[PDB]
Amino acid sequence: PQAKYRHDYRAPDYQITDIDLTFDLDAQKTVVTAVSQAVRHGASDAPLRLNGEDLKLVSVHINDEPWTAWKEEEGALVISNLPERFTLKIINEISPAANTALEGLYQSGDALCTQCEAEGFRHITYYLDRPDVLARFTTKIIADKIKYPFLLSNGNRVAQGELENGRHWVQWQDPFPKPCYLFALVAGDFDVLRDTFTTRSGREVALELYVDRGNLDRAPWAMTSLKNSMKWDEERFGLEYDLDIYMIVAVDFFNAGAMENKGLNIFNSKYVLARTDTATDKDYLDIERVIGHEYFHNWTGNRVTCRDWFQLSLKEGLTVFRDQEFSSDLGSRAVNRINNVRTMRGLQFAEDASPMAHPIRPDMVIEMNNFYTLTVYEKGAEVIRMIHTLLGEENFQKGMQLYFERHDGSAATCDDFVQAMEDASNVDLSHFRRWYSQSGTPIVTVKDDYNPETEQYTLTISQRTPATPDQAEKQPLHIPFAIELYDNEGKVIPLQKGGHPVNSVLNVTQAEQTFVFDNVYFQPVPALLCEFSAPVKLEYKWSDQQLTFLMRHARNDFSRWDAAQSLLATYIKLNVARHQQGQPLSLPVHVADAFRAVLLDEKIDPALAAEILTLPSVNEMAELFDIIDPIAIAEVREALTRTLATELADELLAIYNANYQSEYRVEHEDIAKRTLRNACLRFLAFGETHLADVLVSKQFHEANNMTDALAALSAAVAAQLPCRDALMQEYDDKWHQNGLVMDKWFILQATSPAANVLETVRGLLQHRSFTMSNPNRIRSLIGAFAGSNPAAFHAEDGSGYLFLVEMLTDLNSRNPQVASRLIEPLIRLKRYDAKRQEKMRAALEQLKGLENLSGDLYEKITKALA
Numbered sequence: 001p002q003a004k005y006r007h008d009y010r011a012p013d014y015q016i017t018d019i020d021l022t023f024d025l026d027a028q029k030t031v032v033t034a035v036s037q038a039v040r041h042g043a044s045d046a047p048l049r050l051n052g053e054d055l056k057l058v059s060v061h062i063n064d065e066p067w068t069a070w071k072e073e074e075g076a077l078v079i080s081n082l083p084e085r086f087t088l089k090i091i092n093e094i095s096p097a098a099n100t101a102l103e104g105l106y107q108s109g110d111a112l113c114t115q116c117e118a119e120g121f122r123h124i125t126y127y128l129d130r131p132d133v134l135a136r137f138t139t140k141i142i143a144d145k146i147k148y149p150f151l152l153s154n155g156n157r158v159a160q161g162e163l164e165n166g167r168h169w170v171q172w173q174d175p176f177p178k179p180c181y182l183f184a185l186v187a188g189d190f191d192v193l194r195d196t197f198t199t200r201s202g203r204e205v206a207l208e209l210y211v212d213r214g215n216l217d218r219a220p221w222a223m224t225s226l227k228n229s230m231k232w233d234e235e236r237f238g239l240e241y242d243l244d245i246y247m248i249v250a251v252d253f254f255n256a257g258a259m260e261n262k263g264l265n266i267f268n269s270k271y272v273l274a275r276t277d278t279a280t281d282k283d284y285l286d287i288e289r290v291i292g293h294e295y296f297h298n299w300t301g302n303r304v305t306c307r308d309w310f311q312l313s314l315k316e317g318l319t320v321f322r323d324q325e326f327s328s329d330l331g332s333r334a335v336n337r338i339n340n341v342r343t344m345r346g347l348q349f350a351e352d353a354s355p356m357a358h359p360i361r362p363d364m365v366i367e368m369n370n371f372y373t374l375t376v377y378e379k380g381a382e383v384i385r386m387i388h389t390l391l392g393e394e395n396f397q398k399g400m401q402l403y404f405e406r407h408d409g410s411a412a413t414c415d416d417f418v419q420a421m422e423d424a425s426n427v428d429l430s431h432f433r434r435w436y437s438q439s440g441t442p443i444v445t446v447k448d449d450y451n452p453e454t455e456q457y458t459l460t461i462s463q464r465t466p467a468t469p470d471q472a473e474k475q476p477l478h479i480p481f482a483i484e485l486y487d488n489e490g491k492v493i494p495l496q497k498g499g500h501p502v503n504s505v506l507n508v509t510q511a512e513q514t515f516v517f518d519n520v521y522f523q524p525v526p527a528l529l530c531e532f533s534a535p536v537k538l539e540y541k542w543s544d545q546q547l548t549f550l551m552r553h554a555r556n557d558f559s560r561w562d563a564a565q566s567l568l569a570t571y572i573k574l575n576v577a578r579h580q581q582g583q584p585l586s587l588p589v590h591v592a593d594a595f596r597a598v599l600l601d602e603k604i605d606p607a608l609a610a611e612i613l614t615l616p617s618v619n620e621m622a623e624l625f626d627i628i629d630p631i632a633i634a635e636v637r638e639a640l641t642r643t644l645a646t647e648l649a650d651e652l653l654a655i656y657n658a659n660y661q662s663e664y665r666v667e668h669e670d671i672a673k674r675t676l677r678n679a680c681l682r683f684l685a686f687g688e689t690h691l692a693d694v695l696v697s698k699q700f701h702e703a704n705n706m707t708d709a710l711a712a713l714s715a716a717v718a719a720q721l722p723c724r725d726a727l728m729q730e731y732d733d734k735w736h737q738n739g740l741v742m743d744k745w746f747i748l749q750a751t752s753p754a755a756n757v758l759e760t761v762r763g764l765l766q767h768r769s770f771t772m773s774n775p776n777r778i779r780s781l782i783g784a785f786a787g788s789n790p791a792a793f794h795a796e797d798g799s800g801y802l803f804l805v806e807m808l809t810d811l812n813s814r815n816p817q818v819a820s821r822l823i824e825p826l827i828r829l830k831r832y833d834a835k836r837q838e839k840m841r842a843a844l845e846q847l848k849g850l851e852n853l854s855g856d857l858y859e860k861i862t863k864a865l866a
């Protein structure tokens with residue numbers, strides 16, 4: 001399997017302008033008839049090369065003439081001797097029931113549905129399966145009426161009929177030209193939640209959410225969130241929906257989260273279905289996020305699409321940015337920002353130091369489904385947010401408007417978007433463009449000096465990006481570096497120089513530079529990299545007192561949280577070293593007192609307090625170190641929790657009781673209170689055992705919502721409380737028939753700190769609620785074990801690695817996309833000690849030798865073993 005390179009992009013030899021599809025649907029054998037109107041742009045002797053995978057070709061016609069000048073090659077149908085313009089007709093057969101990979105047309109329970117992004121449409125018929133080929137689609141679907149009473153595709157229904165033998169048909173038309181990755185088809189029997197939204201200018205849009213029979217009680221929040229997405233896009237970005245109908249279909253078998261197929265989004269049911277007894281606050285907010293995300297793609301992705309897949313971030317980084325702004329505007333901006341930063345520092349930074357490192361706009365790709373990454377998505381969004389930071393909101397929106405004005409109806413590039421932003425704002429983004437082409441995380445080193453004689457404060461800022469596995473050459477970036485200087489009373493010192501205000505976003509563009517501020521009347525405590533203003537590692541020699549001062553005084557909530565993270569980081573590192581020496585946890589009294597102050601400060605937003613009181617995950621902890629000791633990290637996180645639970649016991653219980661709420665509501669103030677309360681409960685669970693057991697079991701049994709029940713159950717597991725087994729069995733007995741709800745329980749099994757967790761996880765492969773056929777089950781058990789139980793996954797005997805090899809041996813053949821997702825923990829081997837590294841290598845070597853190794857795994861394994 002051969003890499004493709006961005007620099008090899010060339011406009012296509014042929015275009016397709018219109019495609020008429022007919023599906024004669026059956027799960028065992030579907031017959032597809034595709035009639036395309038084509039135009040040659042290249043040389044008269046260049047053949048038409050159509051992509052196709054696992055198709056059974058029945059016939060090829062060119063202007064109704066059966067064609068002889070063609071051949072099939074690996075992954076292609078190559079047609080020679082064509083006129084300049086012509087009708088292509090292909091008939092081919094496919095087999096949805098055999099499609100375990102869930103790419104193309106496949107079966108989800110009794111439904112048939114598609115997933116075409118990135119290169120799935122070629123599993124349906126022979127086509128120019130590349131996103132710079134846009135065409136107007138009409139789609140006729142013919143099927144058994146009892147099995148498939150609903151037959152859906154993109155756009156509007158234009159024709160309908162009934163046939164003999166209990167078959168019927170429906171034809172759809174979508175007036176907007178699209179790349180084929182945005183094609184969708186769904187067939188099945190559903191309950192349908194129907195509603196309407198009227199856009200700002202008066203267009204009435206029929207909203208239809210299709211869910212499995214019996215699930216309509218779990219549909220209203222997703223519908224509500226769609227309507228909120230539509231309104232918000234109008235208010236913030238001035239964008240309205242452009243069709244008559246908006247359909248969403250929730251399917252249980254889906255490799256990823258959700259898909260923005262024009263007018264017919266297809267969602268993993270995990271990001272649709274919610275009721276207060278089945279879904280947590282975090283599920284509600286995830287659903288809101290993802291519904292929004294796919295909606296936002298209607299403009300950033302569909303009305304302007306991608307020229308080639310190396311431009312994926314053009315839509316994904318921008319659309320994540322939009323989903324984050326949506327979430328932030330509707331909810332707590334601080335909490336949104338905190339948690340996006342946790343993901344960047346804790347998961348994205350790890351990718352950017354791994355063998356799979358790539359720039360947000362990749363240069364080389366073997367399997368494009370491997371590049372739906374933290375980097376393309378989350379770091380992509382940080383790059384868009386940097387543009388926002390540099391331009392300001394009004395200029396940013398002018399840029400968005402210029403982008404759409406230039407590129408509406410076409411496929412564009414990352415560079416086109418940056419150019420629009422530059423031209424509309426008159427901000428020079430030439431240097432900035434290097435964020436698109438350079439991989440790895442910049443390290444920004446800051447030193448300071450205060451000169452009491454001149455009242456000048458000098459920051460000396462330096463940057464460098466270390467080399468990564470993919471790029472040996474690195475250069476300085478245009479880093480927007482936001483600061484705020486605090487005096488001894490906690491007030492902001494105005495930033496200025498030579499009598500002029502200075503913008504608080506510093507342009508850090510060189511390897512080294514100095515910034516000098518005047519009229520600095522007191523030695524400042526700085527807030528540096530405010531609101532994580534660039535996706536960089538910050539090296540600054542903070543004192544504990546500067547950090548506790550920020551936790552008390554900083555103006556932005558985010559900076560209060562971030563100061564706490566820097567305070568903890570020091571002691572996390574101390575205590576990992578101590579764990580390796582066999583020593584107890586050491587923590588200064590003044591660090592504990594800082595957290596006591598947060599617990600007792602009645603001015604602090606509970607949402608913020610809750611996040612300060614949520615320790616960094618084991619993934620965020622791992623980013624503090626060059627070589628990761630995952631056992632020491634897990635034990636340190638546990639010991640730090642135990643120490644704070646003891647020290648803060650009375651305060652924790654008082655805050656726990658004070659935030660009790662008898663009504664459950666999905667409302668942001670209520671969520672914040674509950675999050676603080678359950679944060680307190682987490683510490684209490686790790687305190688004196690008897691009290692813990694009582695609090696936790698009572699919360700579980702008395703909870704009137706899944707947030708409170710799960711928080712209690714999760715604490716019982718994490719602290720290994722006496723009540724654990726009984727509560728876990730109760731949840732199983734009550735919820736085993738509900739896969740989404742059981743996913744939570746599988747995650748808690750997989751992430752258990754118990755000594756025999758791997759034995760228990762292996763046994764759960766035979767659980768009544770588990771199946772290797774369902775990506776969500778796989779990810780909640782196997783994936784959570786490998787990815788979120790690094791202490792057990794990285795057990796010294798290598799047992800974790802061998803278990804993952806066994807699972808991947810199956811998944812490599814069954815569902816390579818899910819396999820590739822699950823291999824990630826193994827490809828980080830260079831972060832671990834020599835002995836783990838050798839075992840991880842031997843596991844990778846074994847996988848490399850699989851018969852029929854998928855391209856998905858091959859790409860990652862070869863990078864890892866280099």
Ligand SMILES: CC(C)C[C@H](N)C(=O)O
Pocket residue numbers: 117118256257258259260293294316372
């Ligand atoms: C591969 C696709 C399911 C990903 C989708 N375009 C998203 O960003 O939500």
Ligand code: NA
Pocket residue numbers: 044045046080081082083
């Ligand atoms: Na020709």
Ligand code: NA
Pocket residue numbers: 015016017132133134135
């Ligand atoms: Na076209």
Ligand code: NA
Pocket residue numbers: 182260297300301302305315
């Ligand atoms: Na799109």
Ligand code: NA
Pocket residue numbers: 327328329330331332333
């Ligand atoms: Na808000």
Ligand code: NA
Pocket residue numbers: 339340343
């Ligand atoms: Na996240």
Ligand code: NA
Pocket residue numbers: 289324339340
């Ligand atoms: Na988020």
Ligand code: NA
Pocket residue numbers: 367855
């Ligand atoms: Na593939």
Ligand code: NA
Pocket residue numbers: 422427428429430
């Ligand atoms: Na420029």
Ligand code: NA
Pocket residue numbers: 447448449450
């Ligand atoms: Na200094």
Ligand code: NA
Pocket residue numbers: 345346347350618619620621622623
């Ligand atoms: Na990490």
Ligand code: NA
Pocket residue numbers: 765766767768769770771
């Ligand atoms: Na089972």
Ligand SMILES: [Zn+2]
Pocket residue numbers: 293297315316319320
């Ligand atoms: Zn997306």
